[PDB]
Design an enzyme around this catalytic site. Structure first.
Site, short mmCIF file in Angstrom:
data_model
loop_
_atom_site.label_atom_id
_atom_site.label_comp_id
_atom_site.label_asym_id
_atom_site.label_seq_id
_atom_site.Cartn_x
_atom_site.Cartn_y
_atom_site.Cartn_z
N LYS A 48 -3.96 -0.24 6.19
CA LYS A 48 -2.75 -0.79 5.61
C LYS A 48 -1.75 -1.13 6.72
O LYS A 48 -1.48 -0.29 7.58
CB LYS A 48 -2.15 0.22 4.63
CG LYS A 48 -3.08 0.51 3.46
CD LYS A 48 -2.64 1.74 2.70
CE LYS A 48 -1.27 1.56 2.09
NZ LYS A 48 -0.84 2.78 1.38
N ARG A 71 11.48 12.14 6.45
CA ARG A 71 12.36 12.46 5.32
C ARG A 71 13.69 13.02 5.75
O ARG A 71 13.80 13.71 6.77
CB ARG A 71 11.67 13.46 4.38
CG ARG A 71 10.46 12.91 3.63
CD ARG A 71 10.87 12.20 2.37
NE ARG A 71 9.71 11.64 1.66
CZ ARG A 71 9.79 10.83 0.62
NH1 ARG A 71 10.98 10.47 0.13
NH2 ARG A 71 8.69 10.36 0.05
N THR A 115 1.21 -5.30 -3.85
CA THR A 115 2.59 -5.00 -4.23
C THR A 115 3.34 -6.08 -4.97
O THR A 115 3.52 -7.19 -4.47
CB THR A 115 3.44 -4.53 -3.01
OG1 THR A 115 2.82 -3.36 -2.47
CG2 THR A 115 4.89 -4.23 -3.37
N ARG A 154 -8.01 2.30 -7.99
CA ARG A 154 -7.29 2.79 -6.82
C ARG A 154 -6.55 4.07 -7.19
O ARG A 154 -5.83 4.13 -8.20
CB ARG A 154 -6.31 1.72 -6.31
CG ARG A 154 -5.37 2.22 -5.23
CD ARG A 154 -4.23 1.29 -4.94
NE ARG A 154 -3.23 1.91 -4.07
CZ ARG A 154 -1.95 2.10 -4.41
NH1 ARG A 154 -1.51 1.69 -5.59
NH2 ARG A 154 -1.11 2.67 -3.57
#
Ligand SMILES: [Mg+2]
Lengths: 505, 519, 521, 502
Positions: A244, A107, A302, A60
């Site tokens: 995802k 951000r 994760t 990955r």
């Protein structure tokens, strides 16, 4: 006594659990694909050869950081390591390459922020570089349309919590606020693009680099998948898109994303920032359940073995998490920092292989197959009837494997959705099909390099003998054992309609 | 309905039940799984222990691997101080149990360079000298290391693996002696002070109850502890030994056998028959047997305890990262939820609450995950399976208990109120795993404390004197439970609850079930 | 050796196939017989002498057929049923309430008299001509050439090729010529043609009223004669049930309406009929002439299943032991039909000609008692209870939770009985809906409640004769002790055994919320 | 919509019953075998032709009466009527011949309370008087204890043993007692020979006449089956032995009998006289269940449509009985006096065809297949794994048929064991395999009369296309419908192919 066969026979799930035996050795085959994130601790050819021998099925590439020249060198090293075993097709293990996009972000433009302080969220670009404890700037200009009175705003990966041209918020959870920090809007339907300009460049690079799959960040709707599929174009029509699921929207609109996607990634890290952490297991079990119901691959990701970044052994929670993702029904398990930057990447891969193999024997196949058999739709597809017939026969005789000749992989995938205990040896001449087969639980893709025989029956029989030699050499079965062989009535994809129950010669 | 995963609850298959799990389906206030917190420097002040009880702590565990009787005696005094600070209101008083965890047959190392905090970073391949000399017991370094197992050379042989500090350091045996061992550091790392040593492939001839365990068990009886967590139980005769040690004065103390090695897993059935409960002690179990096999042992023990109606505790490293971080990892949230789903009666916190930086965050997190996981249970197949274990019993109290659980499911009951002297009538209901919380009204404070070992029991301690007319005493206790459910948000007026009472005073007479509305 | 009794080995099986494999002829059943027996009263059973023996043999409901007989005739029958019933009232411990049911004539088509006689018969031969007339001068002059019938609209509903069935569909005719006032037919199947025989026109759309003036007077007569229930013939829709419900009025509002499903329309409109009705009768006699005989078992299983799912009584009726009209023993098919009706879930089984005119009416009642007792132990309660429980898994009704907890407690301890104190009968019906294996002993002071209890499987009603005791706990205990003495003397259980007792928290109906697991004193 | 497919998809048995629909038409295929006892009312070649057209699959000959010359002429007529249809193998239906033996027998006004004395001395052999009773069973006092019941003439009279070379009984249920009547001893282990002297000659005659199966009367233990098997010998090694369970001992030792036998008959007539009539359904459901579990043929017999001996339509109990035997799992249903001596033989056969065809659709296949698989052992037999894989595939695609090429019948029997909904067309070139296939539920045997093609693939495709033609012509399926085909793969049935019908 072996492969948890005493617990396999149990009439109830309670009795199944009671019979789980630590002294019941598993079989050799490990069905669950292992995806390893490649980084500083593993991107050399020498380390990669050891990763493949330890059990890596997919490399990955995390496109959150790193240049195209950096990622091209990683891919080149993955292929050199992979092809170092190509001299022996009987033992050769195909390794897939996956591109994980960065995706769109929000951000901020160090202070302290206290529980109860007032914080104004501004959009005026004058305070773009003048952020402080009273004013905070963000680059997402549509925020006030997606936010409401009472809505929460999370800064720096959920470390800071707030409560609502500008927003007036109260600090709920404080901490040291730095610069250029990620922002999350729990429960908000955000209008960020499906693919950022950087994602467009990275996806086009993945097509040039001949990647097998794309792990598409922040998928919230079917049209997001459609955008990714358009950027991949004709040249990338065969690249699998794994969506995802990272927020409430993706969870709530799961069914349209699943239908549009080739597979799903339960991105627990980002999902656990957006949703309360005590609920992530509900989203994981729901998505694994629906992907198994639809026959689409599902990746659990994760912090599966996080402590192994600094320690050579995982914690008891980490061992349990890998086992329970396999018991849930996850096709693949992923290693992030554990293989990318950790001190024990080889130990992390080996640990995932050992836990996954143990867990696969502990699956309650008796009720699983009854439920999948019951929920299966009645259709006129001959391949679907052959596949269920093969999995039913494999349980009846406890076969050493189900051998499938496949061009595109679809025939082996149709068997895998029924979750046989027996490994599926998918013989293919297509190298991309071989790499992509790792996304489906139980498929052992073997790449046939023998030239096509002029007599088609001989070419089929040649590929069946290759699968027999692979199974014998890899310890799956021996001469005299019973195996199931799936073939079709003519060359080309779509004709698998023949099942044989045959002894190994 | 969109609450308590009732849509998932209705599924005809386990696969569809998983497909219906909903992140937007909120759970009921009540949290059934007990939380055991190891008390230590980070949580032994009265101030912190009050917040621990408000966050969810049901049992205070005192680990006797470390600390003196004075230290532990002060911790227990502080636990009782924190607990009784809420006694002015019996409707809101939460009973708190005290558990003594024994040291057991441990093998430990000395101090590094005279201090308990100094660490010598060992390297892979380096040679190490294991010594049995009391001179090097406080001057331990990267070349020489002392341990306290004297019979080490007779039980261990060349080639065997010696694990140090939670198995994180491996030492292969190369040479042996009378007071020494020569090893090769297979897995290097920072070797600290007073670290545990394991020998999985060894015939350790240590006693069932050591001289220190005898002293600690006696101190537990004088301190009125509710339960003992008996370390490294290998067979039923080890349980009988602890039962005989506790004697008459400790006859009511519950013995929970800790399964931490292969023999314990192998002889599990006889250990379970002799014990009051089990602890899946995953820490040592994960070093004693291959770490990839711990989940098999966990699920086998939870399943067999659920089948036998005996409490089972899942323990060790459930939220380990929370010792340093305020949020757990995704694996940690998953482990806690999966232990609750497997059927664990209690979940445990060790370093997270004894020495970590975020003890209250860990307790709150375990409460948040347990309650979410309790709603996610496929009660439909679970109750169906438990009912078929002993389908015909001649016990009228058992028939009463299963009828009350059946009625609680039928009316999606807010609680099952049970009047109990010894806890038995509440324990009999808990064995059937109802979705509804069990409010066990008792006048015996030990019973109220011990009830936390069984999933779903909310013990309430009635303080009112015994009424002359027994029917009025029953109605006084039932009304107290109604007040508890209302004040704690379990149910409101009009809601339907199940009430379990007896036909005369004393234990073993529970035969009456009533479906009554909340007044 | 407890498991060696009542098919408990088969009861413990994890699969239905294993449950079948474990069925044991050497596993004796309990004394209790849950399925109710409805006997049609007629010339063979009309006497008080034979009616007392019907009650002793197992009769629970006396069915009076209004297709024949005057009000005078049926008033005497009801009198003899009440006489034979009250001949046992002297001892309440052994008294068995017997219900009375009125089966309406309904939209029926009948032939006239053969040669002026009621018993006269003629031989019809295959291929012969038979003229059907509507001319009333042939009403009592039928023979092999001319047959009369009372359905004046017959020529407009049938055509050439139509099949006309006479006498339980044994005689079949095919219309060859349809006339202005007649029908020339060809005898397809012949045999003995008698007087006043039922006629069926399956193809035809018969326009007779659901509640004719005769039915309105018969229903009104039933209200006066205090009948427990009405078996409404040929119900085709909910509005038909509402018409019967209207005729009974407020004076007969507590009488139960059992709708007889006898034709294609009744089966198609089944769901609306069931919701409007108090129960259902699978009237297989007419149904098997109206629809192909091979499809009758489909309608029977469909109707029993839907009634069990809805919690409403269902009676299986007609030709269950037909050979017992002339023989003292049934055929193997008859033994199998009675067993499979109980296995399907029928609350009641019925007897028509077997008790109304046959030579062995007592032997027929006894054979139904013996087979139903064996079929009851053979029920696979494990899967049945699980499926019933999953129909309404969440309810607000506390008595519905109490009933299900009592059934669950009765399986756990294999109780000899579930004792239920009830005023209206609702609390006993709520338990019976869950199909416990244990007999339900319903204690009531209401005599109509006691008689109507027979419509629900498993309810053994007992009528309390004692007056209302001053203290309410003493009144409850007197009624519980009455059930204890009933079960003891009837052989359902003995001292020391465990029973389940359901009572209320306050006097009156609608308050059953207390379940006690008590030993027999 | 058709075939009870709404009901088929139900999650529960209760929901499945609720969904049974009288307007849901079945497929043309009828899976349950129909055995017809041939007698004076049905032995004419022309009537037999009509019985075959109506649906007769097996002709049963009751050897309890009739000489060998009479029975061989019935067999000649059955083969004559059967072979009249051989000029068209697409429509030709094989017809099996069965021999039902008489079996060992016990042979001889009473009042409830009278003292009746059973004597073993042959002095009262000719004096058939109502004071003393003589039996021809010399070991009667050793098999019956004090308290035992003695039944006389089809259980019309019952006696109770009060004293015990003689028995002093008290008449429990009286009646008229005639001469040469049958005797039954409930719950006794009678030691009569497995095959009497007439039975041996009858069995030898069966082998001489090439019968496909024998219904061995009064089977009490495994050694009884072994005795029949010895008499049939090497010349009768292929004749199937169906054991008739007619008494308590047969029901008790059923597991050892089933293992020794090829199949079982639930002979409810005699069984109903030996055991209480209200228990006959328990024994029927136990035997059908165990036979289904074992994969062995089970025949339900006696009084299925008894009223049809005199009437053209059956009663409701009779229609219910046939349907419930099919739902229970009976491979075959039988007609005795309805086809042998009744006035409506063709109507009886036609009624069984109609009821069974409706009842096969009403089967709850979902739970049935789950339980057969759960109760199935994990064998290493490749043909069993192929059979179970073919049945699973036939449900998944709702196939029009499972086509099986078989020599002995074994591979078609193995598929039948898992009760597919689809008909199993067994293509064989063995005439006895074709006839015997009728004992197994769902097998429609087709006798291929074409010569063996030299190319093996062309021979397999001729047999497969023959099954395709048979299916279309009989209405089982049409062009485009998916079918499952079981063959050998190389010149041991181990290949399953899923194909559209051409
Ligand atoms: Mg430990």
């Amino acid at each position: 006594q072996t492969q948890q066969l005493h617990a396999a026979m149990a009439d109830t799930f309670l009795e199944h659990m009671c019979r789980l035996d630590i002294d019941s050795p598993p079989i050799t085959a490990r069905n669950t694909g292992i995806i390893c994130t490649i980084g500083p601790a593993s991107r050399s050819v020498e380390t990669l050869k050891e990763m493949i021998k330890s059990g890596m099925n997919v490399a990955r590439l995390n496109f959150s950081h790193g240049t195209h020249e950096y990622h091209a060198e990683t891919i080149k090293n993955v292929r050199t390591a992979t092809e170092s075993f190509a001299s022996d097709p009987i033992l050769y293990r195909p390794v897939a390459v996956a591109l994980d996009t960065k995706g769109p972000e929000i951000r901020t433009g160090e202070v302290e922020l206290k529980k109860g302080a007032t914080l104004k969220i501004t959009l005026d670009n004058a305070y773009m570089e003048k952020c402080d404890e009273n004013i905070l700037w963000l680059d997402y200009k549509n925020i006030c349309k997606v936010v409401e009175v009472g809505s929460k705003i999370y800064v720096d990966d959920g470390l800071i919590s707030l409560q609502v041209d500008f927003l007036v918020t109260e600090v709920e959870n404080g901490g040291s606020l730095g610069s250029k920090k990620g922002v999350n809007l729990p429960g908000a339907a955000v209008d960020l693009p499906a693919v950022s300009e950087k994602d467009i460049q990275d996806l086009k690079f993945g097509v040039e680099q001949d990647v097998d799959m794309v792990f598409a960040s922040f998928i919230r709707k079917a049209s997001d998948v459609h955008e990714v599929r358009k950027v991949l174009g004709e040249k990338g029509k065969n690249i699998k898109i794994i969506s995802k699921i990272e927020n409430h929207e993706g969870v709530r609109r799961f069914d349209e994303i699943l239908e549009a996607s080739d597979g799903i990634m339960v991105a627990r890290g980002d999902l656990g920032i957006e949703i309360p952490a005590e609920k992530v297991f509900l989203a994981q079990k729901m998505m694994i359940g629906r992907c198994n119901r639809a026959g689409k691959p599902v990746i659990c990701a994760t912090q599966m073995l996080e402590s192994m970044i600094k320690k050579p052994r995982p914690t008891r929670a980490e061992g349990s998490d890998v086992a329970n993702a396999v018991l849930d029904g996850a096709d693949c398990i992923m290693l992030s920092g554990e293989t990318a930057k950790g001190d024990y990447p080889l130990e992390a891969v080996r640990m995932q292989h050992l836990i996954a193999r143990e867990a696969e024997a502990a699956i309650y196949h008796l009720q699983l197959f009854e439920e999948l058999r019951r929920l299966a739709p009645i259709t006129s597809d001959p391949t679907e009837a052959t596949a269920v017939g093969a999995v039913e026969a494999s349980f009846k005789c406890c076969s050493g494997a189900i051998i499938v000749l496949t061009k595109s992989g679809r025939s082996a995938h149709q068997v895998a959705r029924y979750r046989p205990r027996a490994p599926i040896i998918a013989v293919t001449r297509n190298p991309q099909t071989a790499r992509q087969a790792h996304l489906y639980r139980g498929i052992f893709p073997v790449l046939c390099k023998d030239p096509v025989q002029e007599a088609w029956a001989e070419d089929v029989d040649l590929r069946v003998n290759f699968a027999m030699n692979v199974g014998k050499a890899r310890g799956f079965f021996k001469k005299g054992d019973v195996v199931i062989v799936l073939t079709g009535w003519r060359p080309g994809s779509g004709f698998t309609n023949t099942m044989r129950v045959v002894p190994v010669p």
